[PDB]
Write an enzyme that holds these catalytic residues in place. Sequence first.
Site, PDB file in Angstrom:
ATOM      1  N   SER C 140       0.823  -1.205   0.000  1.00  0.00           N
ATOM      2  CA  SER C 140       0.000   0.000   0.000  1.00  0.00           C
ATOM      3  C   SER C 140       0.860   1.259   0.000  1.00  0.00           C
ATOM      4  CB  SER C 140      -0.909   0.038   1.219  1.00  0.00           C
ATOM      5  OG  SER C 140      -0.130   0.166   2.396  1.00  0.00           O
ATOM      6  N   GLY C 144       2.407   2.525   7.066  1.00  0.00           N
ATOM      7  CA  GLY C 144       3.778   2.808   7.465  1.00  0.00           C
ATOM      8  C   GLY C 144       4.766   1.757   6.984  1.00  0.00           C
ATOM      9  N   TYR C 224     -12.462  -5.957   2.626  1.00  0.00           N
ATOM     10  CA  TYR C 224     -11.150  -6.204   2.040  1.00  0.00           C
ATOM     11  C   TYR C 224     -11.141  -7.477   1.204  1.00  0.00           C
ATOM     12  CZ  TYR C 224      -8.805  -2.358   4.394  1.00  0.00           C
ATOM     13  OH  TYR C 224      -8.405  -1.103   4.803  1.00  0.00           O
ATOM     14  N   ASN C 228     -10.073  -7.402  -2.612  1.00  0.00           N
ATOM     15  CA  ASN C 228      -8.874  -8.149  -2.947  1.00  0.00           C
ATOM     16  C   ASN C 228      -9.147  -9.220  -3.989  1.00  0.00           C
ATOM     17  OD1 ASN C 228      -7.471  -6.548  -1.255  1.00  0.00           O
ATOM     18  ND2 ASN C 228      -7.396  -8.013   0.454  1.00  0.00           N
ATOM     19  N   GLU C 254       9.755  -6.855 -20.807  1.00  0.00           N
ATOM     20  CA  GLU C 254       8.779  -6.523 -21.834  1.00  0.00           C
ATOM     21  C   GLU C 254       7.728  -5.541 -21.325  1.00  0.00           C
ATOM     22  OE1 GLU C 254       8.430  -9.892 -24.429  1.00  0.00           O
ATOM     23  OE2 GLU C 254       6.403  -9.288 -25.057  1.00  0.00           O
TER      24      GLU C 254
HETATM   25  N1  LIG Z   1      -7.334  -3.017  -1.405  1.00  0.00           N
HETATM   26  C1  LIG Z   1      -6.862  -3.252  -0.187  1.00  0.00           C
HETATM   27  N2  LIG Z   1      -6.370  -2.202   0.543  1.00  0.00           N
HETATM   28  C2  LIG Z   1      -5.894  -2.412   1.780  1.00  0.00           C
HETATM   29  C3  LIG Z   1      -5.878  -3.678   2.351  1.00  0.00           C
HETATM   30  N3  LIG Z   1      -5.347  -3.564   3.591  1.00  0.00           N
HETATM   31  C4  LIG Z   1      -5.026  -2.267   3.807  1.00  0.00           C
HETATM   32  N4  LIG Z   1      -5.377  -1.547   2.689  1.00  0.00           N
HETATM   33  C5  LIG Z   1      -5.179  -0.113   2.468  1.00  0.00           C
HETATM   34  O1  LIG Z   1      -3.857   0.152   2.895  1.00  0.00           O
HETATM   35  C6  LIG Z   1      -3.792   1.366   3.606  1.00  0.00           C
HETATM   36  C7  LIG Z   1      -3.185   1.178   4.986  1.00  0.00           C
HETATM   37  O2  LIG Z   1      -1.969   0.499   4.840  1.00  0.00           O
HETATM   38  P1  LIG Z   1      -1.680  -0.927   5.526  1.00  0.00           P
HETATM   39  O3  LIG Z   1      -1.264  -1.951   4.510  1.00  0.00           O
HETATM   40  O4  LIG Z   1      -2.864  -1.436   6.294  1.00  0.00           O
HETATM   41  O5  LIG Z   1      -0.501  -0.517   6.541  1.00  0.00           O
HETATM   42  P2  LIG Z   1       0.830  -1.396   6.748  1.00  0.00           P
HETATM   43  O6  LIG Z   1       1.626  -1.472   5.488  1.00  0.00           O
HETATM   44  O7  LIG Z   1       0.485  -2.768   7.303  1.00  0.00           O
HETATM   45  O8  LIG Z   1       1.716  -0.560   7.771  1.00  0.00           O
HETATM   46  P3  LIG Z   1       1.384  -0.216   9.295  1.00  0.00           P
HETATM   47  O9  LIG Z   1       1.248   1.286   9.419  1.00  0.00           O
HETATM   48  O10 LIG Z   1       2.595  -0.700  10.044  1.00  0.00           O
HETATM   49  O11 LIG Z   1       0.126  -0.892   9.788  1.00  0.00           O
HETATM   50  C8  LIG Z   1      -5.198   1.906   3.691  1.00  0.00           C
HETATM   51  O12 LIG Z   1      -5.208   2.910   2.713  1.00  0.00           O
HETATM   52  C9  LIG Z   1      -6.085   0.726   3.334  1.00  0.00           C
HETATM   53  O13 LIG Z   1      -7.236   1.073   2.607  1.00  0.00           O
HETATM   54  C10 LIG Z   1      -6.368  -4.754   1.620  1.00  0.00           C
HETATM   55  O14 LIG Z   1      -6.358  -5.888   2.093  1.00  0.00           O
HETATM   56  N5  LIG Z   1      -6.864  -4.529   0.353  1.00  0.00           N
END
Ligand SMILES: Nc1nc2c(ncn2[C@@H]2O[C@H](COP(=O)(O)OP(=O)(O)OP(=O)(O)O)[C@@H](O)[C@H]2O)c(=O)[nH]1
Lengths: 425, 54, 439, 332
Positions: C140, C144, C224, C228, C254
Amino acid sequence: REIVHIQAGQCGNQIGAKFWEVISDEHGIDPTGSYHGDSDLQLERINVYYNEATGNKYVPRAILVDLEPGTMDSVRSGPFGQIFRPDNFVFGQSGAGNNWAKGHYTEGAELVDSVLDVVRKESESCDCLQGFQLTHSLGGGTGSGMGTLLISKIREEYPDRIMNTFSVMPSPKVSDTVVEPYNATLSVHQLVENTDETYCIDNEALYDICFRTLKLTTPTYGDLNHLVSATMSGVTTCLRFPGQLNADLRKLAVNMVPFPRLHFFMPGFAPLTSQYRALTVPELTQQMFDSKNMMAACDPRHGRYLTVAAIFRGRMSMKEVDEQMLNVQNKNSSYFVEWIPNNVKTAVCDIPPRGLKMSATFIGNSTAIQELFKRISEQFTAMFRRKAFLHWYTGEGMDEMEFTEAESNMNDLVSEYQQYQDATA
Amino acid sequence: MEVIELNKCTSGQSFEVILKPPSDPSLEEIQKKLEAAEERRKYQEAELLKHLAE
Amino acid sequence: MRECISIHVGQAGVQIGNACWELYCLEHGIQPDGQMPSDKTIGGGDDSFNTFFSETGAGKHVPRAVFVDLEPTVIDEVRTGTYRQLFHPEQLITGKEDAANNYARGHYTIGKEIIDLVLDRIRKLADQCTGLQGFLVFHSFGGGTGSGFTSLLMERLSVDYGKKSKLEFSIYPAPQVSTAVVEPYNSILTTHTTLEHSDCAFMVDNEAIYDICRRNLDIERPTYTNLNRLISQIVSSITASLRFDGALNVDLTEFQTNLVPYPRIHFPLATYAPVISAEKAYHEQLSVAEITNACFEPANQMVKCDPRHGKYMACCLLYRGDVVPKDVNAAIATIKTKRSIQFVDWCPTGFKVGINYQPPTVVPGGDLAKVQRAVCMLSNTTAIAEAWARLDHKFDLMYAKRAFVHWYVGEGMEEGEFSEAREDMAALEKDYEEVGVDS
Amino acid sequence: MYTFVVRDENSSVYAEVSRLLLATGQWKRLRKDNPRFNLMLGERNRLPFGRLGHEPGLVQLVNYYRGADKLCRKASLVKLIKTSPELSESCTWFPESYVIYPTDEREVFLAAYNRRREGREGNVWIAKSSAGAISSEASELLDFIDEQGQVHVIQKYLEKPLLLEPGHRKFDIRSWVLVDHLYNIYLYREGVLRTSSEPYNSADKTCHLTNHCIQYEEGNEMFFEEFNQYLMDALNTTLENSILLQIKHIIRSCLMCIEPAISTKHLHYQSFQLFGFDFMVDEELKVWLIEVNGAPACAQKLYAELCQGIVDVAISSVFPLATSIFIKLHHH
Ligand SMILES: Nc1nc2c(ncn2[C@@H]2O[C@H](COP(=O)(O)OP(=O)(O)OP(=O)(O)O)[C@@H](O)[C@H]2O)c(=O)[nH]1
Ligand SMILES: Nc1ncnc2c1ncn2[C@@H]1O[C@H](COP(=O)(O)OP(=O)(O)CP(=O)(O)O)[C@@H](O)[C@H]1O
Ligand SMILES: Nc1nc2c(ncn2[C@@H]2O[C@H](COP(=O)(O)OP(=O)(O)O)[C@@H](O)[C@H]2O)c(=O)[nH]1
Ligand SMILES: COc1ccc(/C=C\c2cc(OC)c(OC)c(OC)c2)cc1O
Ligand SMILES: [Ca+2]
Ligand SMILES: [Ca+2]
Ligand SMILES: [Ca+2]
Ligand SMILES: [Ca+2]
Ligand SMILES: [Mg+2]
Ligand SMILES: [Mg+2]
């Protein structure tokens, strides 16, 4: 992961005891530390607040502190008194005399090491410690003076952990002694430096809610502590129950506090309970944002919200929740800062509190909180301009300079809130 | 509108259709930044513990 | 046969990785215990699916994957899930405490403590590769870990695996699904740090996936899992050329060659069609021309934006199912006259097309109807810059007041890194305008 | 209620629309940069369409069509008419025009100019550009274009304009057209004639310009009842028959032409826009499109009723509150 809980002083121990009663009920833990719940979500995040001793027993990760034994004795005799770890009771005999200096500098200094010993012992059994939550009042001696001294020592020994407090602000409407504005002013400065999140629980607001909304002609401390325990259960729900947000203290601090000093929250609850009528989501949202449902005696229409976190508990329509939240933001567009996008966050938990099909808890970082700190400052100055009652403190070793500095710091805090109440995009 | 580079197999085919022709930092440089950040953290923490000592 | 290693970082990257590898296993006939009946070469092979799965003497097909998260609860779902038997414990790396939605905490503070272990496990996967192509990195923008640890990892991958291609699948932040108020900050920071270390990046706007789930699947409040599964359909259509026999997009190089003429503008817009509800009783099967027309509907794009007001630099069409080139060329004929498809003057106005005869696979009991033909269009268009503009504006609103900045400086970052990252984004936006607009 | 924002204080029409919206009591204005708005009465230049339609829970509407500048820019209009099959260089209602840089057409313009001098035909041309707010020699034209630093159009000057009597004087016709979010085309029933008071002298820009700023009837603005009565008395015909069918035809042609490129159906935000069409009329009662204006002001008498028309047809059709003054130009 784990949270270490500390309750200090009479007020701190009474609201802390109510808190453990309420959440032990929500997690299905009986007064003997045994689980009797029907759902697994009760135990999924149980270790955030409870250690497990063999025999399938759960013991609150809680530390009870006071400089006189009475309130802690009552806690041991009250309901759920047997759930606490007996080693975790830490108390003296002299008391603090509603004197901040006695709690911070003289009597409290004698007991602080024993408290920190129990704190260390609890921390060592923590897989990964998030931080600490302290319950206390700012108007007394022990919770205020020793409470803040404890926070200072804990920050020294655990600089990277989060420090969270539920702090009861004094009010002339529910006053124990005249020196409460001194104690609170001295405490606020400490909190401004050594906490990340502080829930401002104003006794004036609690009194008004009991009198006006709950129609109680003569409120007692127990009646106020019912509101306090309901609120404390609300704000910690995301910590205790599984959810899409997977919230912890540090994420809450990061997203709620745009500027380190401005970390004093206004809690709110709905429906105000002390009735079988079902409450709809629009009513929950309208009551939740109403001043009469907030537990700091400030008018949100006198400032602007920097950030808001709201949690809805019970089985309800999430689409309706989002609709009502967006709607209330649009109706009150003038009261949310525009230079922080998406500054209102909503969470849902399927499990409702005891005796309600649905409720809502509100956490607001608003500039209107400056009103509270202005109130105290006025009271402080009213006595300080004549040096009234100061001898109680100079007798313990303090100097007028320390009072002048605490006053100056709190007026600075008010100024800082005003700066962002004006700022726009 | 022309079709070029047609490749066929059992799983599928691919081709191109044209409609009109045209009209790094080292490892040490990384560890210097990471170690710099660790030092700024350690300095701010030392200032905190000094303040608490006062 | 040249291998590809997938790296899933943070919650979003890990859960999306789960959806993807479940879908891959369904697509290749691999069962949850790793056994693949149709694979007659036990313990080895250089088939096309071997770019994503290695083989053990016991007949188990093991994903060439690494899962990384700074806290364990999400990857624990992998450890105890349906496909737990698929992965080696060495492939699932977890930390103690997450990054608390703080880029600086994931890049500097906490990342520096785990980067070498991650690189170690990755090196262990690379050692069993006869000819590693490069990495597919899922994460994402807003988290963080997802932002900070991924940018650090991409730097170290450019060091330890220079000459190897790196592709990103990036979840772009939407308030409808967001987790933090500081996500714009993390987005700009990780984009600035990652930009020169990524050859091609596919952004997925959670707002677009959310709306597609509401509108086409009649899911009032998508989870989610829904998001997903849709995202994994798109990812699968993008990596299918790597996992199956074919002639178009057979190696990671490519993707750069076909989709990215200039290195910095390496964010292709993906559009997918059709997305049909499964609980829908009465279905009608869309033609090649209908789905190909849908590729130009803004409501089917992975990032909401208007390509009509931008210029294409490359357009590639990936079909799956009952499709023959004749219908494709017919549809293209229609669309070229009915849509505003302007190209930059320094690129051909062609369409690279690929067809996989195997129709899209869906998860049983999922919310996606199994269709007879589908298409994913990857086009590099300046219109996607709109998303950057959106993000940058949010950054600006907060950074003008230095809101939340102290949480980053408190981790070891400096206020200057913010302005440096923001200036890089302003450069990126200007690049997009130079390439795509007339006076 | 409904939130809206204002980002164009200079707008004459939407200052009045902004006035009315508050007057219904159900619309609340916001600060310029608050993005939680239902409606944007936005700016003329640099309007950030990319930031519209991403606010959850909000239906967002804007009073401008992104991409409609191809119609409201002179060189863009000429290029759009020459290169669109729906319009084409053949179309009868647009005067012969060329684009010249100080993608260029300086060679074909003179190529026709020679064909006109040799043919002894009336060879007067006019050069102008979007920035501004006539000769028989081309050398005098191009030398005038190179002295300013912008793209200029050279268009045939209509040497045989229809002249109002008494006066022997030239006019231009302004029609206001509202296009709503569904791309319905509404022609305001009230147009204006902007006339010249000095008699036409085919042998001084004031006599040959109609613009009003450079300039019988009050304010050189003749309205449709009077122009219609004059057409009946003097020429035994009506405004509808002699002119208005052609005006409606041109409006429909121009708008239908660009519909696929600017339409906000199936988009994440919705647009509407009010246009000012400027037409010319020759002595054969033929209507010529002169120019299209994307941000026009109204006639002082016609601000009322029309602005209420914008609110009725364009704004409250999407955001409803608690006889038609428009002619719906049908199309498919
Ligand atoms: N499409 C989708 N988006 C996700 C999912 N999980 C989190 N997000 C998005 O990711 C963002 C938050 O980032 P996270 O991946 O949850 O955070 P992290 O990388 O685990 O890092 P931390 O801050 O340590 O929790 C938000 O904008 C969420 O909408 C998922 O399973 N599917
Ligand atoms: N080909 C032509 N033949 C005759 N007159 C012409 C002409 N082209 C322009 N004019 C005259 O010049 C005037 C203004 O020309 P132009 O097309 O630049 O309009 P404009 O943009 O300056 C006024 P507005 O902004 O209200 O549309 C018109 O009123 C018209 O009378
Ligand atoms: N809400 C609430 N406030 C209390 C309670 N007990 C005391 N207070 C308030 O706390 C302040 C007195 O401090 P107290 O806790 O009694 O003194 P301490 O033992 O030295 O910490 C005054 O403002 C009292 O109104 C309680 O049980 N509930
Ligand atoms: C800007 O708004 C935000 C506010 C908080 C968070 C993070 C955690 C969190 C924590 C909570 O208590 C522990 C909580 O309420 C019970 C809660 O309610 C939504 C959220 C994330 C945000 O984006
Ligand atoms: Ca003693
Ligand atoms: Ca000791
Ligand atoms: Ca094999
Ligand atoms: Ca590289
Ligand atoms: Mg007391
Ligand atoms: Mg995480």
